[PDB]
Write a new protein. Sequence first.
Lengths: 526, 523, 31, 535
Amino acid sequence: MMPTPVILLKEGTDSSQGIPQLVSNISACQVIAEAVRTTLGPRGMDKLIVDGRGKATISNDGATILKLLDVVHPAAKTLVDIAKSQDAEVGDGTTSVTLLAAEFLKQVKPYVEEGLHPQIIIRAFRTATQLAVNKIKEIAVTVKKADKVEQRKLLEKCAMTALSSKLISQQKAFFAKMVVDAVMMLDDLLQLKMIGIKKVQGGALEDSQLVAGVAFKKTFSYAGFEMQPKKYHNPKIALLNVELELKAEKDNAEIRVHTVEDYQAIVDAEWNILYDKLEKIHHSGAKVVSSKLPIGDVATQYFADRDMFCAGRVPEEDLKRTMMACGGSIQTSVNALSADVLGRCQVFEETQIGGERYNFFTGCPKAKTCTFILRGGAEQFMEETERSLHDAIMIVRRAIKNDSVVAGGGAIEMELSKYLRDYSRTIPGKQQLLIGAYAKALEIIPRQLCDNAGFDATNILNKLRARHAQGGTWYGVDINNEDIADNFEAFVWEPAMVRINALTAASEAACLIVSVDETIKNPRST
Amino acid sequence: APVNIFKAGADEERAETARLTSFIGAIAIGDLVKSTLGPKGMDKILLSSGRDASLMVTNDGATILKNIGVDNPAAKVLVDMSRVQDDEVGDGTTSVTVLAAELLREAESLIAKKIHPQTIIAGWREATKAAREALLSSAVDHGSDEVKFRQDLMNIAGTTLSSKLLTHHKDHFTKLAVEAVLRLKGSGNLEAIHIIKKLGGSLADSYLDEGFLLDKKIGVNQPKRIENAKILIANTGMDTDKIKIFGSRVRVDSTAKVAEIEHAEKEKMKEKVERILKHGINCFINRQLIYNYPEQLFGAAGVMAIEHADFAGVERLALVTGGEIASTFDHPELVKLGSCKLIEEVMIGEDKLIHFSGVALGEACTIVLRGATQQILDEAERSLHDALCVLAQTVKDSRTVYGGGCSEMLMAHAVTQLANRTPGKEAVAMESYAKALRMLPTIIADNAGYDSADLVAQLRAAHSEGNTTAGLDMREGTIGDMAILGITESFQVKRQVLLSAAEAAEVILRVDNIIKAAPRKRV
Amino acid sequence: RGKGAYQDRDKPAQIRFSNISAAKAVADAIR
Amino acid sequence: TLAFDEYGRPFLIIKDQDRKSRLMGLEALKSHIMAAKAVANTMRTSLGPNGLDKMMVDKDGDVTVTNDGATILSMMDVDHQIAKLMVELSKSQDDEIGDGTTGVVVLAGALLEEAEQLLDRGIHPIRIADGYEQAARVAIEHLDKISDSVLVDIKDTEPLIQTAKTTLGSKVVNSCHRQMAEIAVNAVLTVADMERRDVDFELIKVEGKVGGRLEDTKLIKGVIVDKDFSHPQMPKKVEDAKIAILTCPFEPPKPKTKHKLDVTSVEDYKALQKYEKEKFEEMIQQIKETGANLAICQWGFDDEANHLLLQNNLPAVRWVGGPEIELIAIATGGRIVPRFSELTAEKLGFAGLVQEISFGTTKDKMLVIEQCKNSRAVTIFIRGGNKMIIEEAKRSLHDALCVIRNLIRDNRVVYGGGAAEISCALAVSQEADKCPTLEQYAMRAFADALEVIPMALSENSGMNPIQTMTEVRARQVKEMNPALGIDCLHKGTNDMKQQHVIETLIGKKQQISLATQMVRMILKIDDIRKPGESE
């Protein structure tokens, strides 16, 4: 009843200010965190979310959950945007980052209600963040056994760990070995665009295969492609961007004829031009001819009578991979074809995996790409499998170039809280209530790694506190025995960068929330 | 009819849907209660639309049908039939319902053969007479030799109860039915055996009270227990007597006279109680309520008084105490008193009741019915009512027939043997009567889950060559001797099932046209 | 031989189970 | 609370939060299992030789009665995200193997049903899912222990015909129990590639025409197309066919580009009239010079061509479709010729008697080829007294063709009739107690679930499942485990070796693996976020 001037300042704008607005902003962050609280750890559960199309997605990755929640609260969006970054920078840093960032605010929530201006909180968050990050660098371990079985084992252990919290139980040795070896097929850019994953329905997880070469799905064909046998033991591959239709035109020409002699000559010329191109393709050995452009009926029969195979309408993404897989080049014009532009492989066959036809290439020793073929009993089943392969490849790619790893589980988070407590007990004044709050939030990881599957959370956390304060700092939470286990000796390792970036992103998220005092929402929304 | 309609808001059906919808709607009644026929049938729950829905679980066809709310004007014919069967004998209500339905089903099939409806009716009349003789010639009599008569009552009680909730409690409730009736030795009032329903304990924990229980606990300032009490019952006024002058006022010059009259008012109430007490009594039951003033006078006299035990409670007490209503007391020497041993109160189901034990000439009893749930209590009560109603008549007409389908096959045999001596125009209808009679042992076997294809063939084959006592053995799934097994039914119950189904069924066959008046109060 | 056969196809085929489920819903309510 | 904060202000997290629903607990898990019971109760009614049919009414009013689970489950209107996955399970089995369209739903349902008690015992939902893997490995390993075959795919096709009889015995075509079993064997073995063990699905075409009876279904060593001779008086019989396959219209050649012929003088007008007449004569004589006596054309004819076809005694048909001319050229050993001027005798097809068949009062004029030369394609011609039995017959023969292909892919078989399922259940039970660390309850639940198949088979066969299961399971232990199953009529004894009940090894291996994986992906869920009303 108060803002009732004779002339309004703006229009109809909502505005909140002060302590209830900060509490509301923190509360929104606590609620959105609920979407991932049960997804952490090897015994996390999956979520089923239905979109407006009626299609469900089943997943447990934070980078897929938070994007489907239809968040509108200005503050809750903060914990989503930081997931967008961690998806690129880290990969594993999804559920753990969201939960820690939310806890950073919960620990100070009971204090921000009664004074304690955010200006002092933000400075303490920055101090504690720098302390925690430096501590990781001082404890991470490396190896000196590069280009030996010791590095292969490191990468395999990184892959088997990366495959945790997926729809994977006994297939870790099956997928992990192929992920490590698939990446070693790449050049020294390790560009992920060189690894394809394709889903073929039918069969179990263990029936998947890693193909050194490429394959295409045999798209729209014409009458005559039931012919051309699919048995080749040493084919050459021509990748062309040439039109092989009779109706190919320049779209701007008109052929004006004044006599019958030229009438027939044009009719014959149109057929002769097509045959000229086909004869130039021949005499090359390119028994396999592929193009992104149509290949018409006349060419299909020409190739059949010449004992050649062709297939058109191949997407550019597969032609580029085919070029890199077969070791050749892609030529647009046929007027300059030679043996020096063709690809080569040993086996080219059309198989029937899952009932659908697939044309596989293999046998090229200079294959810079590969394709992993997934088999499964459902669309969603394979879709979740594909996601598990993308993360495992990402962790292995990074582990090859950065061998600095830390203990998994909550082992590092307990040591970080130990270091911060040792710091805080040497600092006088208000900082004791702020550095400690940062440290206390760090236990959300070993807590949730127990709450989602029992393990007597109260006492097993007390054990971690007793052990880390007296002995080693690599102790975490086992899954098989409901007690403490040494993650270092068990080789439960994660790249050091996962936690370093998690601390940075979680700290910045907190500073974005506590630094806001006012929210202004324009009324114009149509 | 549909062309050139001259009706206001009414309609009619002729020769096309009138009989079709009548047969469908009526025959459906049989299928409803069909599942309740025999010792292995399942029970129904009937639900209301709301407003204290008062859920009822029951087996008996009469209690099912009377709560359905049948709207079809032809189906109502069989509903009323089942009411009459319940009112007359109190048993066989399912059997007569399904028998009439099966007769009607056959009639529709006979119409499809282009048999005139009057020929079908005529054939059923002849077949009915044949069946009546089969029952008359097969009746079993019981006269003297009481050691055999009592066994017959145990067989009749067991048969009726076997079809109700009280299945595996036969060793308790069979005696409660037979002995309660035998103790009456008089008119079948069916009110001299009272049932009190209490929660707590199992059905097997029910028992028969040798005496008589009253409600309305023993007063305020009155003895709680007197040995060798003399009992007086009454139907008189305790207070506000307003003696018989209508339009009389007290009109005085001062309030002193009002106080003096008030004393006179109490003096006459004192005299009234003294006139009752001169009888020499220990226990006083009055239908009308007892007010504060006579309650003190009876207490001071050492005599208990019960107020308003029930409207008919005093009449029931008269029969079990051997006294008289005594609505007026002016000649104590002409008033008969009762006598008992104990008037103590007993605790039954956390409720104190007044127990008159050892009462002379006690031609009445009370059954104390215990159960876990209210649905158990209500269905168990009905089971007692049904068995007592049949027994109260069996002790008057000792003729019985053999059950288990035996009587039904005997009736079907007589109809078949005579139908084959008649010309085809009518024999086809008499045979249909016998076919309906044989549906009853078929339904009984089918509800239990027995191979009726063999039980019916074996039972008919048995009765084709003597074996006039053969019937269904519902324990093993075979054919047995009804006399040895002890499976019998009251003659009157079986007679009425035969006659009622035949008489009611004709009502439907005679109708070719239904005229339906315009409805009222439907908007 | 199977010594007989009986086809049970009627409304009780579902009630015999529906009544049990309703009772379970309350039985667990106060667990 | 949502839409109300402790300060009296609205509290809004996600768009239209008041129209959402979330319930996690154990209720998401019980809801998933309960919904699966509704699915299992459907398919269990069509399992075994007495399986009952379903009538499916489509959204447009069309009605078809089928037994094939692929046709039943694919026509559902179920709006439940997990029940939809139960349909995908039957799809994966149909695509890989093509047999167990009923079995994988019944088995997967039993695993979900038996799992219900395990949650109530307090066993972690994921430990249940993992426990099924430990038991499943046992059943799979023993499944491959008992297997033998004498099929060589040369002449000793007796067990191959028997396999087709086992599959077809469940369908509505038992009036042709033998006839269709033999058709299916002959259809595949005449086109299958013995070198690679591959069978190309395009080499067996299935056609049909309403009328007659199932007993009139024949296997034609050739192709069937819609015949429509361009000239109505053209003879309808060719005894020795020399077939020209042409993809050019019988009209004067035209350019594909913009032409716009300029005509100025009368000499130009009249000269063109002559030149065009000659083109009609040349295009026909170019066929006769090759010795051809039957032309089959993708395109139509000009009126001028029909007369020339008559005078040159050259029968031909018109407007034969893409896949029809493709199959004809392959079946007859010929090649498709682009133009008239490219015709040569070397590209002609060779075939025997060519005839068209008239059916009753109709004008269908269907092709029959009597003789062929080393054809690698066959056509099945299905008859029937109504549209429904013919469409079901198409699926019945499809299943028979699929199990033949499966034996060619892998010639290892097992004994059916429930013998494999009961034996697996017994094997898992024996190892379920080696060792009962945590998973004792889960491994036993798996063994019990395996019995859902002989139990449902017993019910549909009219037997009591307790009286039947207790006898067979005892007999398989008291003596060295025979291939002892169950049946409805018993056929004497239940020895599967004497009843010849043959099923494929790779079929059952997929049924166990695919059912197990489907159960896992729907147990490990505890949160469903489905939207409600639009507004």
